[PDB]
Amino acid sequence: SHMTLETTLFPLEGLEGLTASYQLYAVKGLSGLDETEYHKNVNLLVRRLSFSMKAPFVALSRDGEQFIAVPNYVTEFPVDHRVVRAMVKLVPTGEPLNLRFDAADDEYDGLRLRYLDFVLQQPLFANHHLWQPGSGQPFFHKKPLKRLDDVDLYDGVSVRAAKHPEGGFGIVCDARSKFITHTPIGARADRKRLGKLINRSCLYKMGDHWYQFRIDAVSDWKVGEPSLFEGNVPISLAQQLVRTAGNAAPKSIIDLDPEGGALEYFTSTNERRMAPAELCFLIEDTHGRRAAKLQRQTILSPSERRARVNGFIRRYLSELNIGGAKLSAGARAHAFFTETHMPPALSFGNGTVLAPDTSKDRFQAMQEYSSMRRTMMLDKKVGFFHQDVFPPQTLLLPESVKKSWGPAFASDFVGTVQELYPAGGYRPEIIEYRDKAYGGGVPGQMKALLEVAERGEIKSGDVLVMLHRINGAPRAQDKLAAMVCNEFEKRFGKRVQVIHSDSPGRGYKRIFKNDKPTYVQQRGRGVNIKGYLKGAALNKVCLGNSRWPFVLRDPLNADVTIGIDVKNNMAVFTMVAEGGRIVRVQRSRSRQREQLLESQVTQVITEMLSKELPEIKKQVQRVVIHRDGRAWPAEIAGARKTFADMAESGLIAVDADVSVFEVLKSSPAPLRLFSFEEPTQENPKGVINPVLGSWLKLSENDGYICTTGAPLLLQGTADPLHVRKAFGPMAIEDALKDVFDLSCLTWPKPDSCMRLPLTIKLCDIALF
């Protein structure tokens, strides 16, 4: 009975008969709107309405955005809102909307949820042992869980609570972690130490009011010095933290050193405000500093993460009173039986097909399958699906590295390519650029790369360039990698791939051989250079030249899908047709930061398709889109317009049906799924990961797939992937099923489980 899987969905009781929703308004200042700016207006405004008037102000509508008030407001000031900036008139079309939490699935299921959500964390914000970093964030203890030299580990739980699959509403929970340094920033921290920190985030322990904020400006006054005025008499912020302090106000908040730093930041509603440096505690960004003995702490075995969540539910959310003081969370999670998805069968080269076996208990048969994807890809009887010779290549090397270990590395690297893709016959020209001549920063490195390209020294179409790493942290993003791709593709005719000098320059030493210096490999600490050469041959060369190793024999529900991602004013569109036999990626620049226009979406896709349409050997009649993040209604506009138009021409059946979906890799309402194993000694309550194809549908618009799961996880607990329906006619169970199939095309690392579907995974590697 392994199929029996428990969730972190706790049923909710006490809302049977709790209709509490009652009104409606309408927007009028939108006369100049952006199709993307208009939606930053509302949000800044519902916050001021929810946070000033401190009752539930909820706003989640279609087309022209609308707001729910309570009839209980004293004086709303409807036409008197942002008379400061734009003057929206809040037209009261208020029809009493009285929502019940058992109704059939309605469009104001969106509102029934943002209301439940505002009021269910009032008993959590008023607790005292519990602090919330910001609006709608997990709820963390004031007390840390581990001490952990220099820096405190705080545990917590995220509670969001959307629809239930056996009717009604319920609770969703995930544990969480957060790393904060032990000892406040301090009142003998000077001006230069304080600047060195603008735009980190700190935990500001105010009084009993603990929250999080990002630095903006080391202020112009110290803690004691008079800066703002309550009576025009400047008063010192020590004075201000007293005025706003409460009865038994703690010691720290009324005995600050006046000779200490003061920081600035902007409220959740965009107000300027200060905070003493004493009382501010910096959050370790442990992906910023590669603290991999600080990541070996955030990974939580399954039976823990269950026990942490169950413990939090029983201890904090039980007696729970807001007006209607009912609504007790039922403190036994949701469980179902379900059928888990088998892996798809796949097509390797010379028509040999891998299909999972259905005699072996699911487990032993999938480790078989997932290892086959590698052994088959390498085996020369079968091997790559697409076998053919490579068109001309070019490996482009820093001249500092052509003279030191270039040749050894290039020799091994070409060797590695031919033992992986023998049919290609790899043989790349070896060009160089003069990495020491001009500058050594991103400009200059670029001037040398461009100067070489100018000369026409790069014959051939496809290139692989080796570059240098300029700055640390993963949030930096290599502006140089991206920019070499941009210029090389756009001004010259090139499809470019990128590796970096640092990583192989670890795997080569100089030994002295036969009266000459010579470079040979090394395998000590550092990088595993045999594995690195293998993986970079596959990713940068075989995939870089669009030679797919294995491609999904049997068809998906969609006939075409399309990833989309915009981050840092760059948009990325992928496209997967046939079984994976047809794949494109295209890049184009986005006027909005992360948002994309609607004329641009309609165009990029009508041009990226129609190139490939003759190869698609069907009438094409079920298209899907996957969006990385929020799918803004600008985008969804052109999405149907694109395919409606192709429904006229004849490129499609006339009855096409497009569908938009949002893949939440950072899921707004997270969840875990477990299942069980006779409690062994080791494991008191016998909690393992759910088996790899496990899936769960809550609503018609929300479900989770295990793209990562039991047989092939290496350690930790599996993170179900939250997808959310956004438009269009496709069964969400079908969408989850072939998002799982698209996540079994594990191209960059075959024997491993990949969490994202191939569509949006390429969106993420394509912008590094």
Author numbering: -1 to 766
Please give sentences taken from the publication describing this entry:
Argonaute proteins are programmable nucleases that have defense and regulatory functions in both eukaryotes and prokaryotes. Here, we describe a new class of pAgos that uniquely use DNA guides to process RNA targets. The biochemical and structural analysis of Pseudooceanicola lipolyticus pAgo (PliAgo) reveals an unusual organization of the guide binding pocket that does not rely on divalent cations and the canonical set of contacts for 5’-end interactions. Unconventional interactions of PliAgo with the 5’-phosphate of guide DNA define its new position within pAgo and shift the site of target RNA cleavage in comparison with known Argonautes.
The structure of PliAgo was determined by single wavelength anomalous dispersion (SAD) method with SeMet labeled protein at 3.28 Å resolution followed by extending the final resolution to 3.1 Å with a native crystal. To elucidate the mechanism of guide DNA binding and cleavage site selection by the newly identified D-R pAgos, we determined 3D structures of apo-form PliAgo and of its complex with 5’-phosphorylated guide DNA (P-gDNA, 18 nt long), either in the absence or in the presence of Mg2+. All crystals were formed at nearly identical crystallization conditions and belonged to the same space group, containing one PliAgo or PliAgo-DNA complex per asymmetric unit. A crescent-shaped PliAgo molecule contains the N-terminal-L1-PAZ domains on one side and the L2-MID-PIWI domains on the other side, similar to other eAgos and pAgos such as TtAgo.
